[model samples]
Every structure is written in structure tokens, then in C-alpha cells.
Target: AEVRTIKVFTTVDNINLHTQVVDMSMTYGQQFGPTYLDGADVTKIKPHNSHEGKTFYVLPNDDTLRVEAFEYYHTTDPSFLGRYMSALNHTKKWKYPQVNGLTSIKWADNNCYLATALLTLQQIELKFNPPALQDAYYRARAGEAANFCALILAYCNKTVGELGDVRETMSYLFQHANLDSCKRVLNVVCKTCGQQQTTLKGVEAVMYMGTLSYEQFKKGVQIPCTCGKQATKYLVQQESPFVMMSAPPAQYELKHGTFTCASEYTGNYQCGHYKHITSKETLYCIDGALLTKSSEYKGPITDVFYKENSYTTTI
Candidate 1:
């Protein structure tokens, strides 16, 4: 069976382009037309109207397009996202079945560095915003950022006193500021005095902005006990640890969902006899769902299907 889907387009700073063909069941493949080259960020690539990923489109230089579904890029797990990249960028190009498309899609570049950046900034604001309305808003904000940038480049270094027009003045020193992603907290117990101290360990260097990266200026003078004794042992901590979060039920209000069921008979090696198993399921709203399944078979690769008729009940 064939399926149709959208093409991602982007033009922000580039290199960050990803074609989002989010169909996990690429079990469908039909070349849909008027393909919208959804270019959200195309700066890194000119027009970057090129296939975001998962897919590459057409030009007279070649006829057929190359596309990947999901990717294995991890261990050869061959899972959905895995198969995505695998089918996505299949190594043997010619080996993939003919992905014949009947339409020469009419696509247009749908982004701008300014508007797209604005779209990035106010993502929700413009998600459903009109296309024509964007460029107007785009140039308006572009003016503000441009003015801000000009204000910085023109005056932050050389202008003003507290006397004229009350403009904020600060010096912009061109220096690389590295924020410590992690912090080391050392709980040191002095071997000589038995005193406990929590110290932030650092390289001993008396230079500013010069000695950075890879050069640990470890001097003999490290830690001393409370009573001027110099011997100790070392607990640790980092600021603001990373965390994983899930969207609340409020995001979707999805109570619960049942698995799509199907069944097939692995008839001999030819995988002969086949039937379209129309299965059953209930959309659940409450999370924990205990549904029932009916069939199970060993293994055969006719790209087959199996199982049918499952039921759902809610509490």
C-alpha cells in the first residue's frame, strides 16, 4: 500500500534541518502532491528547501527519491525510530523498492531568517498565524533587533555619561564566558586535624582570561584544616541537575488507549493464506489499561500480520 505525507522545510541557522516524516507505520507509501516544503529554518542551507531528512526529493538530475522511515542509529535494535533512519538513509540506494511518485510537487520557500527567527521566538504566536501577516510582523521585529544590535555595537563601548538623555551605558568586553555546567563540591576531612570542610575545588592560576581549558594549575597548596593544618580527604555536587519531565494529562486529556490488533497465518514459507484481520480496541481515558489479546505465532518474514478481536472495559 502507498501513503502520502508532508515534507519539512526550515531555514533558521541551517545544519539543524530535519525532515519530519513522523509516520511510524511507514507501512504506507503514496506520493502526495503539492508537497509543502515546510522550511522553518533554512539559513544553514540556501533555500534549504531540500529534504529535511527522512526524505530527499526530485530534480531532473535524478528521478526517484530516497527516504528513510525511522533509524536504528543506536544498537541494531531496528525499532521504529531505528528503522526510521535505516529506511531513512538506506545504505544501498538502488536496493530499496521503487518509490515511484506520480507528481512533480509545487513547493515554495516558506521561511525567512527574521520571520522564521520570530517564528522560533514566538512559536505559538505564529503557529496558526497567517502567512501574509508574518512578513509584516517579521520586518517590524527585525527593526527592533536591528536597532538593539546597532545600539550595542555603536555605543555600549564608547559613549555617554549619566548626564545626557539617560541612556544605559555599559562596557562590552569581548571575552568568552563559559558557564560551568557542573559544580564540584568537595567535603574535605583534614587528615591532621579531623576538621570537616566543604570546598569548591579549582585550578590554582593567577591569570585572568588567559589560562582556560585543559590547563589545570594544580599547585601544592590546596586545602588546609580549620586550625592552619594542611591535609584533607574529599563529597560532590553539581548545580541544577538535568531532569526529565512528562506533559500532564492536561496536555491531551487522553484517558487511555488500546493497541491496534491484527493477525495473519504464516502459511508455510510462501506465507500463503492471508486475511485482513479487523481487530477491536477501546480508546481509554484512564491511564492503566488492561486489555485482552487473542493470537500469537512464532516467526516468519512475509512482512505478515496477525491477531484479532480484543476487548476493553474501563473501571
Candidate 2:
């Protein structure tokens, strides 16, 4: 047997406003036709007239009547007292307008009296801009320099001795070197002392740069180091296609080679035999040994040649 389910709209205060009967046994047409229910069909149902200006809809099951839809109607259009009352019943749907710092709405509320509550909210301003490299550099330089010095000292201990002073030691080592040499020192330190003893390097420092905000760049950002100390300064290698240093060397200088000093003479060593010896001079030892060498030989040279320093400083 088929049963009929009735739906009604009412206020939360239990005021009955409207009702409708959904006959499950009959089709929509049959329920509304002149042959059934005296032509009082679903089509005759009007929201404003039957529900006293409250919006309501029949569920497909014909068993449950929801009153929240009417509340939504009031929230959407709260020009009248009736709409405001409907909104008040479902206060959860009310949302305060979210206007960011740089923006604002012209009016507090367009609908009812209580709309003015939105105006009481304070506007919060946020500043955002690209970080200044110079400022970031200054802030991070101290920490980075400290880490750099520590690593270098630990690495060059046997070669440079533990003088127990960072500034003096760094000055002595970097007197003839640039920042690139400092980075090289860090690399060597990392290889020997392990990465945990150094500050951020290569891509890791670049990744840290991404986390910094413009304000952080201006004020300063502290990058965590593996050595438990914080590094506020950073060295960033600019993306390629961007030249870091001045243009290439117009002419390459003689920077490296194996040079046989006069004291330890190897008889058959030719200047050509010396790897990376840029001097073209030929020498005849007192013992009738022909040794080619350069007058510009500063000391015992190695096979490593650097054409140009290829890095820039950043924070």
C-alpha cells in the first residue's frame, strides 16, 4: 500500500507557516489533475503565499522537510525583516566578508540593519616585495663568514696551524684569494671534515634563498647550518646565461705548473715535460742538464690551472 507524506515549513520558534502533501501512490500529474484532491496540486504551491515568504522545497523521499534552505534564501537576500529572521534561524550560514589589506568594500551591508557588524573588523596590512640582495648579504655575511672560517681552519690545520683566531687566520689564507677561494676551502673542508661541519652549499643554499621573503631579505634571514649554528648570510650562484664576473680573460696568464727548484734538480726535465709550465724559457744546469723553467715561478707549483674566477657573492 502507498502512503502520503506531508512537508511543512516553520520557524525555529515553532510557528507553522505552510504545508504540502506528497502522495506517493499517484504520479505528479495525477496528484495535480482535476480528478484528484480537487485540483489542489503541487503547481498551486507558492513559496511566499503558502510559507509566509519563507523558501522551502520538497525532498524526493517525501519523508523529510528541511528548513535550512529558507535560511539560505534570507542570507542571499536579506532586504526584508522576514529574510533577516530566516537568516537568524540559521546563523551558521552567515559569513563575514573577507577583504585583504589592500582592498575594501564600499558598504558594510546592503541588506538589513545588522549588516553594520562587518564594519567593526580591522583591516590588516601586509607588506610584500622582492628581497634586496645587498641587505640579505650583510645580515648573512657574519654567520657565513664564521662558518667559512671554522671549516677552513679545521681543513687547513696541519698546513696553516691552529692559531685559535678566526679573523687573523682567514685574512692570512684569503689575502691572495677571492670569495671563490673561500668556497673552495669550504669544499675541501666538507670533503675532509664531512658536510655536517659546513654551512649551506650549492643547490642547498639556493633552496634556502627561495624560503626567504622580501622582508626577510631586507631585515635578514637565518639559514640553519648542519653545525648547529645559524647562518644568516648566504652565497648564491646566479643562474647561468647571467655573467657573474667581468668578461673572459683577454689573455690567459701563467697561473700553474710543476717547477723544479734549483736545489732539487732533475736532470732530464724539459720545460715541455713540466705539466702546465707556461714559461717557454730553456735552462742549462751546471751539470750540463737542460731544464726549462720560468723566472715568474713563485713556489712549488701544482697541475691545477684556473682561467678565471667564475662565481659571484650573494646572501
Candidate 3:
């Protein structure tokens, strides 16, 4: 015959003490005998015949004795039959009137009971403790650290203004910013300008500027400007003339080709034929002879001629 086993995860409070009796049954087989005995009344004893048997005599009026016995066996002798019984017997001194006779209601599957109890305790702890719950929340979502920090500030009735110049301020802000409100502040876009003028957003941007100013106060990142009257011009000057020329224009043609001028050209042909060619018209030789034009190709043709183009330029 194949043996089956069940596992339960739970805390001590929700654990059905009687369930340990079943666990004891499985661990020590029915041949071990002395299946049931009320800790209060040692005379009330029942024995099992087969390992598969599920019969056990119920305890008398005092059920708390059973609860105590369960606690004792679980904590002391979790595996052996002799030690399990010994631990239960040791609990004879335990009193039951204190518990009002509350007893463990038999569960069909003790493992399921244990598992449910474990989940119940977890939810209770998380609901009651904000810091612990938030720690778990932030751990699962590390990307939201900035937003979480902002929330902690709110919880402590604080704002970005309280941030200080000391290194401890960073540590303090990171620790107390536990609420989710800061999450939104970190993502807020500039309402005045449609474009993203700054890297940081909302209160986070304010906090960043404040931090920068604080650093400046501490003698940091400040350089003397010698432009004098040309200060504005020097400050507004572009970083580089070729900054916009990082890459070639999209419509740039890589292959070599000849194109006609925009205005109609009236030119003399060597074949004694005078003809007018429209702008951008390609000319082919009838006798496979190369023809020279009055105006040599100047440069690449502008896309402005074709009002429609695929390239989209954005500021």
C-alpha cells in the first residue's frame, strides 16, 4: 500500500491542538496503540487496531486539557509515540476552567486547517502594521522607490521643504517616504510648457532644485562667469554648431544622379537642335552621346520642391 502525507503551514494560535493527535497517529502507526486518552482522566483510554483506522475516543467535558496536551506534544516530542504520550501526561497539572471549556473542533483535513490559519495570520499582521506592509510593497516594486519616499514624508506630516543639506537627510527621506502619494508627484509633468523642460517632475523637481541650491550653498558646482555685459549672450549660446547635424538628413540620396534646374532652360544642342527642358526633368541622349549642360550640377536638391516628405522633424 502507498502512504499519503499532508503538510500544513500555520501559527501556534490557530493550530488545532487535536490535529497533532492525527499527526501522531500517522507518525507512530496504529500498532503503537493507546490511540486516545484524556489528559484530565487517564482512565479514559482507547487503542487503535490498524494504521488506517480513524477511530479515537472523545475527551470528557474538559477540552482545555486536550488543548494543553496538544501544545505540550507539539513543542516537546513532535515525532515519537512514547515521548508524545509522555508530554501529554506531563500536562495533567494544566487547568481547564480558565479556558471556559473551549475545544478544538475536529477538522476533516487538519493540514487544510493549518494552511488556512497561516494565511489568516499573515493578512492580519499586514493589515495592522503599515511599515512592515509598506516594506513588503516596496520590495516587490523597487522602481517606485522615489514615489514611496514621498508618501513617507506625508505620513510623518513632512514635505520636501524639510529636506536638509546633510547626508542624513537623504537617509531620512528614504526611510519616512512610505505613502503612495509621492508616486504621483514623481511622475507629474510640467503644465506650463507642453514640452518636458526638466528631467524631474512635480514636487520631485522642486525637491531636486532645492537640493541643488543647498549643494551650491555648501560651495559646490559654482563657477565664476567673466562674460560681464555679454553674460546673457554667452549663457544662451548653443553648445555646438553641429549639435543639430548629428546624423545626415533622412532624404539624403546616396547614389550619384543628375537633375535639371528649377527654371526651364533654353539651351543650344550640339546636334543643331534647340530645346527647352522643364525643371527637374531627366534628359537622355538619343545617340548614346554625352551632353554638357550650361549649368553644372551645384549640390543636392532640396526636399522643399516636393511638398510631401516622410521625414518628421520635431523640436
Candidate 4:
């Protein structure tokens, strides 16, 4: 059984890039070609909706090409744009959404940095007014953000897929994010939407950035506590004061027994209990107060062992 449903592309960024490609093919028909796209190209692809505007196109590498898509961005430069639209029509048949199926979807293996650039686009898009055409996209994005609980299950399920323990994996991801992914992403969405959106029923969406490795992405990704505490509250609560044993020679008095010093009591008569002493025969004391010594003693008294059962209760 696979641990996760193997993603077609690694991260949400890659999927966003695919969406961009889809949009290009939709607009340019056969004119879209594989040409290199840079940050400037994002401005060319305006959104149809009032809420939408431009998107960013980050290059995977200098060699990486969206020849047709690149041309669409330079629509004013008819020479290149014309060439791109022609190639796109020939190669992709200008079927718009269908063209995505034919295009090589993978970013180059040497192009990991490309994913980060794509993520920046999404981050930037959040700042601008989404085009009116982007209403569906925003609504979908909002749904995904609002239905965080369901989306988490969906993403984890998509990651680990059907065979693995859905419950366990869900719990693991939830625990990892400290059960606050919904709230965090919602905060981002709230900022983007500029207000609360009405909740929709049965709608769930999760946006993927690009092809980031799970291990690398998960590394150092700590979930901040939503409870205003800095750290996660573990399921099993920990006690502040741990239990400890009494020091040797210190009998735990059941009632009101007092700790007495032999040297304090005059020429000591035999007492069952003795005080704890150091190997150097120095008197041990609590709170840095030294135990008193008796002048009558010939040798240093090292220890004062208590007789078994000698500890008495003083109610």
C-alpha cells in the first residue's frame, strides 16, 4: 500500500503553474507555444473577474520554455505573440483545458528553485484584486480555506491515499499542524477576501503550490499553537511538579516529627535517628546551614543512620 497518493506534481505551486498554462491555452488557442516566461509575463494574463488581476510567471530555468505562453504575454509584440499563438494551435489544438492534457507537465529536475518562484506568485496574487473571472477560483480557494477540516483530510488522503490508515495519517497531520491549519489558512483567506464569506455546503478545495518533497517541505515547519500558547499542548498533560524521593537519612515523618540535630541536643543520649553526613565527615545541612558538631566526639561523625521503624509519628 502506498503511504500517499503519488502527486502528479510535487507542490501546490506546480498546480498553479498548470492553471496558468490552462488559462493561456484557453485564450490563445493554437497561438500559445512553449516559450520561456519571466515575472513580467504575469501582467499579460489579466483575470476576467473584478476580484482578479495579474498573476506572476516565474521561470523554472532559462532553458525551460512555455514558448506559446510566453508569446501570449508579449501580445503587443505581434511578431513573437503571433508565432506563439500559431504553435500553440498546432501543438495543443487550442482546446483550452484539453491542451493541458497534452503538454509536458513536469518542471525540470534541476529546477527546484522554480517552485519557490511559483509560490511567490500565489502569495502576490493574494495581494491584488482577483479578476472577476477569478471569482470561481477565489470562491473555490475560499471554500478550501473555510472547509479546513475537510481539506486536511483530503490533502492527507491525497498524500497517503486510500490504502493507508486515513485516521492515523489524519491524526498525524493534525497533530503536526497542531490542529490549527484551518485557522491559519483562513486568516490568510480572510485577509485576501477582505471579509468573511458565506459558508458553502459540501464544497472542499485544497491548493497545491508545486513539486516540493514531503520531507523537505515538512522540515522545520512547526505549527504555532492557536491557543495563544507558544507550544503545542500534548494530548497527555504533563505535571509541573514531578515526584521525588526523600534524601537518605531523612525519615519522612508521618505526622509532625521534627528534624533534630544531635549537636544541638547536649551530650547526646542514644537516639534511633542520625543525620546525613558527607564522606569527608562534614555535617550535612539543608538550606546551606551546616549541621552542628559535638566537641565530645573523638572522630568525625560521618553519618547518622536511623534504626529501622524508629521514625515515629508526632501527631
Candidate 5:
């Protein structure tokens, strides 16, 4: 069986998630075609003319098409909720006016609600781990730097998707070196100090820009000597990827216990019970008759024992 892939709609604004779906005709068989903004439409918006190509679009007429742009929201000082609101308002205005003969405007609105929820969740997760990189940096050691770096690089790739910036950050490390040679430092860090080299190298390659504090830098190269702390272990290659450690065990456990039954009953019997009863040899009784009885008798036996035996025999 083929695994179904989740459909992702990429737009400048997070609120445009539903609008894109409507355009694709997946919901209510309704569609909205592509929107365009020509050069002249860009002049009217504020914060200078710089918003034209990068943020907002300039259409042919006086109207501007604000396709949902959100990279600014992630990096800028403005709150995510504010950017989300702006996106929602812009999408609503474009959808309701019927300015360009677009159809199925309500479908886009439906999708917008769903996309808004997803965007909110992503924003929350990003904020939750504010100290992740710092924590990783502090825990790193010599060969471990590479491992930590790799992990951080992976995180940046998955979260920020900005490799160029990470690389630029790695280049900044060169400024801290006493020697004029960047390659020497790179080679030493990459080959000698396991943690520093790998972590720095990974960040340099993926982030495009990043930096390590003096304490983190020192920790990456520091290793305990056998003579009450010699640093021979510094030469050892890293064993794990970046500075990541094994995840803690799962936070929840199943509360219910497995099935079990007692072979012998030692407790006192109820008033309805009989002192003697025929032993059902076939392990089952049906319609008040034993399929196999050891001997004829006139007493009662617990239904629980009969049911348990019947289950065992049938299986």
C-alpha cells in the first residue's frame, strides 16, 4: 500500500494555506486562479518602496496583490499573531471584493482557518525551545563538538532552513583565531578537536552564519587527562552525531495489566455454591449440560471457572 503524503501549500502568508487549497479545487470543487501584482501597485504601501519585490506585489492597476509572505514574521520583531492577523485581513479583502472575477472565495476562507491553526502550533514550538542550541553548546566537548554541531546543523535545517546563514556564522569563528590562516584553524578543529571541529564545521556548512561563545569554544577542546585529567581523550573521534544524547524514555505507560487467572481457588464459597459438583472433563458446558463429565453429580460450580476452561480448550 502506498503511504499518503500530506499536501503542503506554500504561500507568502500563513493565512493563505486555505486559499491555496481552494485554488487547487480539493474542497467543494471550487477554484481560485493565480493572483498577480504589477509594478505600479507597489507605490502606495508604507515603510518605504522597499516592500515591492521582497514583501508585497505591485499590480498593473492601483491595486496591490499581497501574496502571503511570512519569512519576515519568523525573523522580525513583530509578534507572530500580528503577522497572522495581517495575512488574514489581506486574504479576506482579496477574496471578498471579486475584483478580478475570482470564484469560490468561501472555500479559501475554510482552508485559511485550518492553516492558521497549523501556523500557530509551529510558532509555539519554535518559542518553546529557545535555549536548545545554548544547552547543546554548553554540553559539548572536544570530539563531541562535531556531534553537537551536526545535531545543531540538522536542527537548523529542519527548523530554519537557512544553510547560507549558518555558514556565514561559522566564518565568524575565524575572527577569534590568533593566526591569519582560516584553513589551519578549520583543519585543526575538524581533525583534532572532535566536538569543536564537527560542530563548527556542520554549522559552517549548514547555517551560513553562527558563532560559539568563549566558554563553549573552550569546553569543546577540553578533555580529562588520565593523570587526574590528561587530555589524551581529546584525540578520540566522536561516537555520536553532533552533541545530541539518547532521548529520555517515553513519558507514559499503559496502565492496564495483562490477563491472568488463578489455578486454585482458596477463598470461601458463596451461599449458592455446592460442596460437590460433577467435574466437566471436556473443559466446557453448554445449555446447562457438560460436554464431558467425570461422573454424574447434583451440585453447582462457578461460571467463571467454566468460562476460563472453555476459553483455554477452544484456543
Candidate 6:
């Protein structure tokens, strides 16, 4: 039983949602012929340009075809008192005229509302958000940057449908979407000192300029000794892609048992340099992010991995 009790409509349409539903099924009889809206002149419903392409609205154009509220409202009674009461609450209208077309738009396709809201909202309100998000939108005019849009669309693709409502969806998008790719510094860990640190490499842009390699994150190279004093002892090879270790890392050999670093001498004169350096997992982790770490491996291994940390700076 697929039950739908809510009778929704585009209040400004002058027609109920059920009327649109009826028109859809009615099309079965007409087949190839033009249906109700097909013959209706579209001259008044002008199209608009967007980053993706042209966008045509399903909004009513009693005056102009632009954004207002595109939602449902209920009117259970038509009594004299009900009519008088409705005027006070503005109950008959679903959405009224919005001078600025930024908010209150019901997207006909996938939404990039996060970017839109950032634009629509006043600057006084924007200061509450993270600098990354602020910079993502504020510089948009100068760069015409799609950093926010790409993040919005890339995030939208994961859920696989058009989302509804602004309040819940907007917050949910920011809450779940990972900004690690664009972060200036990442929380990581040191192998020798066994202390947490931040990476030097971070996202510079939203455009598809390039991506990091698997060796990049796992190798613990960018951030050397967290102690800062023993940089040389815990240094990781810059040119060497896979191999890394502490104690200056070397000796391409194994002990009767194993090795340690210019960083350590784990029970023997073994090399600190990690061997079988070409190790890899069968595929990427659940998040589909490669090289990105998920745990701090403080084990006595030749190389260490500092899991990619999760963070949120709310707006």
C-alpha cells in the first residue's frame, strides 16, 4: 500500500498538485500528442542561464517567472470564519513574492543550495562560518570559483536524488561533507615522537587540478619529527615514495629478526627502513578516499600511518 495523504501544490500555480498528477496520467491516452502544458505559450516563462546550462522553471508566471515559495499549504474549511481567519495567517498562499531570488527556490534538478545560501545570506551572518567556507564563497566572484559548487554537486551525487527543503538539507550537507581535501593543514601523527601534528600540504582550490597519491598520506613524510629538535633522526625520504622510518631510516637489510631506525634499534642492528615497501590494500576504504589514513598506527612497524581526522566548523 503506497499511501500519500498529503495533498501538496505549488500555491502560486493556481492549480493543485493533484491536478498535475492527473495531467500526467491523462497523457497515457494522448501518447505522442502534446499534453496540457505543451500547447501553453512559454514566452512568458523565460529561461535563465546557469553554470550547468539552461534552467526552465515550473513556477507560475502570473507576473514574472522567478523564485518564491514552492511548497504546499492546506485549507481544510471554506466557512466564512475560515476565510476571515485565513487572511491573517496568509494561509491560502504557499509562498509569496521574494524580491531576491536566492532563497526559496525549489530546484528542478540536483541542488547546490549550500553555495546559493552562502551567496544569499548577509555578510553579518557569514562571519559565523569557517574561513574555508567563507573563502569558498566570498572569492567566488573573483575566481567564479566552483569550489563550493563542486563540493555541493560531488556531495549530492552520493545520495543519488534531488533533495528537498533548505533548512535540514543545508545543514546535513555541511555536516557530512568532508572538507579534508581542501584543508590547509591535516591532523596527523609523528612516528618517532609518537605525537600528533599537522601536515604542511593542504587543498588550494576546488577545481580539478590534481590529487594526492596513496604514498603521500601513509608515508608520514610531510610532517617530520613533532619534537622539532630531532628532525634529522626521524626524517623521511623525500624522493623515496614508499619507504619511511625513524633513526634516519636506512640499511636495506633485515636482522636475524628485523630492524629499527636511525630512530630506533628494535632489539637488534636491523634496518629501520620499511621493507616490502610496495604493500597496499586490495581496494580503497569505504569512503573511496585513497592514501587517506584512518588510524594512528603506533605499532613497531617500519612506517606509520596517521588516520585522517574528521572535523566540523559550524555556521
Provide TM-scores for the models.
0.16, 0.14, 0.14, 0.16, 0.16, 0.19
N/CA/C clash count, model 4: 45
lDDT of 5 by residue, 17-85 (tens): 332212121221112122222212212222222322232221112111132222322222223222233
Which is better, 3 or 4, measured by TM-score?
4
TM-score attained by model 1:
0.16
Q: What is candidate 2's TM-score against the reference? A: 0.14
lDDT tens string, model 1, 226-273? 678776333233231211111111111111121121112233432232
The predicted structure with the larger TM-score, 5 or 6, is 6
Q: Which ten-residue region of model 1 has the weakest summed lDDT?
A: 96-105
- For candidate 3, the per-residue lDDT at 117 reads 20
Each model's lDDT: 0.23, 0.25, 0.24, 0.22, 0.22, 0.26
Q: State the lDDT of candidate 3 residue by residue for 213-295, as single tens digits.
A: 22122232222234322111001111110110111112222111321111111122221111111122332111101133432
Q: Which candidate is the best by lDDT?
A: 6
Better of 1 and 3 by TM-score: 1
Name the weakest run of 10 consecutive residues (lDDT summed) in model 4: 96-105
List candidate 3 stretches off by more than 4 Å: 1-196, 202-315
**Which has the higher lDDT value, candidate number 2 or candidate number 4?**
2
Residue pairs clashing, model 6: 246-263, 247-262, 247-263, 259-270, 260-272, 293-307
lDDT of 6 by residue, 160-262 (tens): 1334232333333434333334332333444465544333221121111111222332333353454674332111212211111222222323221121110
lDDT of 4: 0.22
Name the runs in model 6 displaced over 4 angstroms: 1-108, 112-116, 122-124, 128-131, 141-145, 153-161, 173-315
